Amino acid sequence: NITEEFYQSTCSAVSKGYLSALRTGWYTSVITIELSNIGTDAKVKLIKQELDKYKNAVTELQLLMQSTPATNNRAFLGFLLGVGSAIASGVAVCKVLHLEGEVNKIKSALLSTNKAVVSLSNGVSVLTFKVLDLKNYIDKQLLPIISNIETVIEFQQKNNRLLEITREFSVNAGVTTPVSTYMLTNSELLSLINDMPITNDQKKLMSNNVQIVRQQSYSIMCIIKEEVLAYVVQLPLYGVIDTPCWKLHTSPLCTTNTKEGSNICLTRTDRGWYCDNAGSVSFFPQAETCKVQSNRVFCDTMNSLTLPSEVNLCNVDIFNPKYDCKIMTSKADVSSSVITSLGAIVSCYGKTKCTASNKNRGIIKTFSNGCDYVSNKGVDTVSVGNTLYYVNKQEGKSLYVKGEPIINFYDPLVFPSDEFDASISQVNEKINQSLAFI
Amino acid sequence: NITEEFYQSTCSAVSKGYLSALRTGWYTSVITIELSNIGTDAKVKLIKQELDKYKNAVTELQLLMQSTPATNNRAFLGFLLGVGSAIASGVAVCKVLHLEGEVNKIKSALLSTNKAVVSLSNGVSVLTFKVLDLKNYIDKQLLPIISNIETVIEFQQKNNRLLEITREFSVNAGVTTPVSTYMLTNSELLSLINDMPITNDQKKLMSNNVQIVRQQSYSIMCIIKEEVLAYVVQLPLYGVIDTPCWKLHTSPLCTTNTKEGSNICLTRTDRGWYCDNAGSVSFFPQAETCKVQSNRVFCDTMNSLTLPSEVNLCNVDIFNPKYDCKIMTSKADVSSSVITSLGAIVSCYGKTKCTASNKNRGIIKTFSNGCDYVSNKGVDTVSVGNTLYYVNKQEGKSLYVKGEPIINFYDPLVFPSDEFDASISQVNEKINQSLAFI
Amino acid sequence: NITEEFYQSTCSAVSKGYLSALRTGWYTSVITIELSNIGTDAKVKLIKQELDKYKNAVTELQLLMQSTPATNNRAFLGFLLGVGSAIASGVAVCKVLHLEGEVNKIKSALLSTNKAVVSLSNGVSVLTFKVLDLKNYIDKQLLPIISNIETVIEFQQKNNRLLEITREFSVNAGVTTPVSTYMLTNSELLSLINDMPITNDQKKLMSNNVQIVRQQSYSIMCIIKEEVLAYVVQLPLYGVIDTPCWKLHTSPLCTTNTKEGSNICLTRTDRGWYCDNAGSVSFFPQAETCKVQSNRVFCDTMNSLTLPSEVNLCNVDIFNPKYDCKIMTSKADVSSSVITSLGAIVSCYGKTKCTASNKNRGIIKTFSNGCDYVSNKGVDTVSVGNTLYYVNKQEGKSLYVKGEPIINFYDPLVFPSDEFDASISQVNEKINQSLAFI
Numbered sequence A, B, C: 001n002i003t004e005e006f007y008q009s010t011c012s013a014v015s016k017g018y019l020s021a022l023r024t025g026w027y028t029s030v031i032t033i034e035l036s037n038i039g040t041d042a043k044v045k046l047i048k049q050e051l052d053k054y055k056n057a058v059t060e061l062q063l064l065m066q067s068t069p070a071t072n073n074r075a076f077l078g079f080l081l082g083v084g085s086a087i088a089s090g091v092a093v094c095k096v097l098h099l100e101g102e103v104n105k106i107k108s109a110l111l112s113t114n115k116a117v118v119s120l121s122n123g124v125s126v127l128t129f130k131v132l133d134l135k136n137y138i139d140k141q142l143l144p145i146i147s148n149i150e151t152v153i154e155f156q157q158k159n160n161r162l163l164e165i166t167r168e169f170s171v172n173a174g175v176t177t178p179v180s181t182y183m184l185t186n187s188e189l190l191s192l193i194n195d196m197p198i199t200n201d202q203k204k205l206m207s208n209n210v211q212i213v214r215q216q217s218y219s220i221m222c223i224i225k226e227e228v229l230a231y232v233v234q235l236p237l238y239g240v241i242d243t244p245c246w247k248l249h250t251s252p253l254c255t256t257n258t259k260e261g262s263n264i265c266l267t268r269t270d271r272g273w274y275c276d277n278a279g280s281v282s283f284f285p286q287a288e289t290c291k292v293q294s295n296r297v298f299c300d301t302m303n304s305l306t307l308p309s310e311v312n313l314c315n316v317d318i319f320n321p322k323y324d325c326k327i328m329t330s331k332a333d334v335s336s337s338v339i340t341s342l343g344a345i346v347s348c349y350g351k352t353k354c355t356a357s358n359k360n361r362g363i364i365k366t367f368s369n370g371c372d373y374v375s376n377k378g379v380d381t382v383s384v385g386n387t388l389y390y391v392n393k394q395e396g397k398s399l400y401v402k403g404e405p406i407i408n409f410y411d412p413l414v415f416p417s418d419e420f421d422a423s424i425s426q427v428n429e430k431i432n433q434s435l436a437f438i
């Protein structure tokens, strides 16, 4: 049940009713492909051509794995975030696979089965998968060599996966995300998730959202040694599930004076996704880092700040004494809209045409200067200047919470007009300094 | 006919002569694939293997469509933009396809033809396409079952499109962009555009720029129901065509005093693409959101601000009284270049080596400290410090408009040196306050 | 030998021991595919179907090349960078290939061989490659037409490369990066690099890092004329190799007073990669633009500033008189971590739980309020609030350099709390102004 409240006083809107799925950790599995260490007619020539693609793929992956895997790591409020190393857990597992005897343990565990748990030498208990046995196919079906065309067809089919895995790694420098169906087919991933040491709620959540799991996973090319090709697939652990989440939408709140350039603006800067988490609130300032599936929101705690739950008071009383609510100030009174979950915020200033329309009937509301809001019931589009926005047509109730725009409480003569990483208190602090000198 | 003017007074350059193609709206088409609801030798075994890939693909897409489609939406002057919901129109059409009887209308309309217009239950008139009839192939060619190898080959060819469509959706969570040739082949797209309810100028523009149309389109996986696979392809509507566009390039303008750290800088912040549109100017602050093809510039109005055409006065008189031109200030006198359409802006400060070269002859100009410009006639590269820039070799005339750098009109002692979202008036406003106290 | 030093005084850490590979220029090669200008049974029907895919691909590429190739160009300290035109060199070479007689020279040079150097009409000496002769296959093997199935199989294999090259160009508007194995196979690229007019150190570096070369290259679709398909592959020139590089990591340094909101913060803004280069330092403010492979760091000089080597003094004495070290100030005392090459910086403020753990033993350190650091020896994870960071497990020694946090030297009453593009001197300059008025 999605709902939404718009706050006329602060030109912001909160969408409630979502359930969390937060990636809090990683699980590393080792996916393996067993390799073969190895007068012409037309059908044998096609076999030699496909066999050469196989050798080249192996040679290509071996040349690729002469270097340690790595990505590119750093050194509205997104600049406040820290800097992780996303594949550091997978790379550490991959580093263990280079120790002597380590690959042999995996090779031995997968001798009689395709699915095995192996505890590596450093105590890490990883699930191991043999997804393709090219050794057994090439040795039992191609080493006999003249032959037939159904072997040519079948060999192209079994080799194609190796060639595609190699292509993906070649244009991604050994590290891919999302994890394609060549790295792990849909059935392999589902059975991997089923055999995973996770709870029953996590298995259902991951199985019902495999496409999201793929986007939150990495495939890390690891080693080719002793006829074994191994890459680490690093899967999300969802350690926070089904807690309340809400999306804060903000838009500029300006005065609407007639004289151009005499207008002052403020904007709440704490927009993003918010999820209750372990007694605090996980705040994701760049809401584009989260993916929404029905009422479930998938985020990654690496792109979050951990905040006191009092941050929610900015939505009811931005002047509350318990949390210093974050705002920016400006003079730029430019018009724009923010499409919310259940409606649209319109910040209409100057001489801009701002309307809301219905498909069949056309314009049904003309906005006046200021910040205003329309629900998605009976509305299909919104227009701000030359920009047409379609609104979301999801079901749910909106509440318009009336209140005076807080920008009216500020005297333009002492208003600090270029504050970015600011708050209610910092702006009051600067006002009182300009007031002292006059 | 592309032309360019450089303004020495403000360290900026405008490239004129371009024609617009602005995505103002969306058109939603429903693309359908008709599905089949269904002792071994070598050729039959290959058929069973390909048939299993088909079942798995269907099963995979069905598991994928258990959730509502969505992307990731937000909550130099790009921070001023609003926030749309790019696939909200497609998702709304897709939501209608889940109503009872809706899929049946599409199935019936496409019974005797592959191209049909269907008015959905909510009055939306959508064009509908059947691009692949796997039902008829599997039922009339594979249900008879021993057989031959040309059936194995042909079935792999017809099934491959379904498998690739499924792969794309699987690593993109049901929403792809650009729209690949598997979603819609080049011929299907061209005939879709031809049968579209659009003007003749729009049909020619889209047909001559299909690769751009692909990049501005989305494919939204929708429903598998009653042996019909349907995905919505959401195509751009170019409601603004052939209006004048120009690209504003800006670069830092600093004083060139000898004492390090005594220099003050300003930079015009209104760089981006500008297109005349419906009596105003559509401003795209993140010029990387537009794609240039010859003299045609393709943009998306969702990444624009609608501005008074008086904003063009900042290029002739930055101190004009009709528009408050946007600038930032700093002390960071770092060297850099901006490659323009027809030349290069060089901001050379401190001890940096800045030159312009020709392929055959080498260095032909050494820049002195300040902001300067060179046309692309006779120039192939520009070097600022350890950075080599190739210049664009497109044809067209540049004009160097002489004038005193406006940074010279500012007294460094009262110059506000960390203004970002500022303007000419805001900076004068702050100067007069620091002047009052001294 | 990677090493790291943490500076408690400034909440920053430097990772030393890396070797550079800086793309300083571009090399343009012309890759060519020779084209053919051209009652049914089952095997001939499959041949006609594959032949139609071939015609459509040619027709598609011809329609694509009716426009000039282009990308999307612009107009912590990344905003200081200039703006290049990445494919301007390739596009210029491609423009020459449209002059009359130019394609014929290439066609003639590659008549008896697949590898040739051709000097174009404007004096550019480009290496030219014929990677696929579909003309000779279609004319000598398919123009004879009933036939066999091994021809159907072989023709699908030889045509597939053309179809995939066409797909890539179709969803990328004629410009791809990275350069896939369809544009240039691994062997073709290696032999291209070997025949390149570059030094022996550059050949080894590029050959041992082809996957990185691919990511730093572009493929530019160019011309279809006189049965020749030509695209320009634009390869990086690494003109700076094996100079020292180091990564600067920064994190917020705040006071740790008990009263909420009374804390002041500063953060060094000069984080990024740094490489010695030609007497200066190449600074890459967006460290995600560089790719690390073992101890080699690959960057692109287009995303760099050229700085005096004195910028390194900010790591030893941020108050040094030779370079004005860049900082930002704020009041936002939010907790976060920065994962470094060999450890983790923890900025722990307020009521946040901050710990460091080992896989087997659990929590081994609890951080107190302030900025602190832990090496990756014996540490596997770090937790700041609800965010778990895995640390990098690479080998190397860390040094903890003790010193008083410089934030303690600032009186909060005159501390400028919203400076972004600031420096040590600018902040002192503002403090002395607020001090004068009190």
Ligand SMILES: Cc1ccc(O)c(Cn2c(NC3CCN(CCN)CC3)nc3c(C)cccc32)n1
Residues within 6 Å of the ligand: A328, A329, A330, A418, A419, A420, A421, B079, B418, B419, B420, B421, C079, C418, C419, C420, C421
């Ligand atoms: C890329 C970039 C470059 C330069 C820069 O500053 C910023 C940060 N920044 C500031 N900074 C403020 C400005 C005035 N302040 C002066 C105190 N009266 C100083 C620091 N205002 C901003 C606004 C409004 C929008 C987006 C970013 C903003 N980002």
Ligand code: NI
Residues within 6 Å of the ligand: A388, A389, A390, B084, B085, B086, B087, B088, B089
């Ligand atoms: Ni829209």
Ligand code: NI
Residues within 6 Å of the ligand: B388, B389, B390, C084, C085, C086, C087, C088, C089
């Ligand atoms: Ni360049």
Ligand code: NI
Residues within 6 Å of the ligand: A084, A085, A086, A087, A088, A089, C388, C389, C390
């Ligand atoms: Ni991590």
